Amino acid sequence: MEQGICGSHVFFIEDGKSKNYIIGKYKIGYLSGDNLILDPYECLYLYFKGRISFQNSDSFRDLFDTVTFDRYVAYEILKNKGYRVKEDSGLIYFRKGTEKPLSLRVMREYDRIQFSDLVENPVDYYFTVDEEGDPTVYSSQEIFPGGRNLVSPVSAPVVRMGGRSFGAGDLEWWIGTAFHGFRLLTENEANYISGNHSASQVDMVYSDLVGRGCIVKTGFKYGANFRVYLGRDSQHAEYLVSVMPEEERWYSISRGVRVASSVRKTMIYASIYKNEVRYVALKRVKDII
């Protein structure tokens, strides 16, 4: 058989195929002194196709161990779709045709991530595959919420009794919920009306949502800070916002996306970046499969 080398592993091409045949059909590898040269991904990819075999029996697992299952699958999937993939510095690049090479980053639940990674994102997508072999691709986009409600500045006193906060019965129609002439308020509502918009980061973002015409209600039931209504007659909040801790793990972000998705909502992650409240929407992609 003809052969090649991956890193430092020798492989033979099966069924008497030519090296140019492999290059022609799978579009990977280049010739070099009678040896077909492939990177780990390409190597594992061809092996799984039953097209190559390794001289050394321990070469398969070594490649897989070094190349990871998570990254390998991201590669395999892309290839088995049509794109041409090329890895470099933790990222995977792929172009559907002779066009723009989209960027992709495999994320693991234990992986750490800051809001800044979502803003200065030279990465177009995020890939994930769960403990069941189920892959998922998310896209990152900044949103700029555009509420439609008629907003007014609200400045009022907050009464604290029974372990909860209250406002007057004639506050902006949507703030808090009516209670015997009073207005039961959430902590964020209490901080917002009493003009304490900087009590924290959630209070600043809370204030910003309202400042831009959004009806903001608690999202604590869903694991997020609040659920946002872009309209007064929008029976269901179209957004779920969660204020992002300077640092956290990827599963919290992946989970927020599923939670939001199970109730037809968009998972939004907000923060104070470079002295401003900015929002980033994470949504699963269905056109990359």
Added chain:
Amino acid sequence: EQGICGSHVFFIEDGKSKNYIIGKYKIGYLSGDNLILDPYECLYLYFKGRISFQNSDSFRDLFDTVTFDRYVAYEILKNKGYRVKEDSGLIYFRKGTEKPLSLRVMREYDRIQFSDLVENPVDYYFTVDEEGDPTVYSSQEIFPGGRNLVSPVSAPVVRMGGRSFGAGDLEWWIGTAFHGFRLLTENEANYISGNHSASQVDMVYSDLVGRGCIVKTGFKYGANFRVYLGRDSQHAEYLVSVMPEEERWYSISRGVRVASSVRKTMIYASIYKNEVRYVALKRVKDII
């Protein structure tokens, strides 16, 4: 007329009699040409606009000793028509001639333990969120019964590429097909590996499977497992999670919201008194 509650004096409205109140709102009682009401009952009527306070700091003090959560629980049941007795946050009530019922007010940040869900003879759990929304729960110890033919299994496990894999001819539902191999979860690897005591969650996994259920990741739902009871269910009836330390109440609330959301029943598992036991937590809607 006169009356005292929590040491605070109150007068009836619209010149009504101390006995008019009793007859209508069926609360409190006469003592000596004076009406006696407990805190909850006093506030209940106050908001009804049927009584007033001699003082002016009584209401607030009254609403402070009685909490908001507990009052709402009381007010709701009272409006439902039930008879209510609000002890220490522990509410007893009955609708007409039916048997009495327990009701514990649970705060979203309360510390809940599995041992509680089992031992507690309380009938229902009450919660009123930060938006005034009340929700009732009921826990029932359950014993999962699946119709799946179970077969012992102890095959070797290969560990590469960061994951665990098994032979491509293992029980059809275990793991996931992957180029002839079978991608497994950490729980499946321990199962076929014979390490059922790896952790508490591995023991319930094993118990679950031992009782004919086809177990899979609850991952998508923020839960340990997804459990199918039939030989070929399209959707797992149950959602099962093993309760940690460290376990606040909002976790359960979230879990029930999640389960309901997808047609499933939220179940919490644990090794109690050296045995894997399960408890289903549901939202109750035929009350309030």
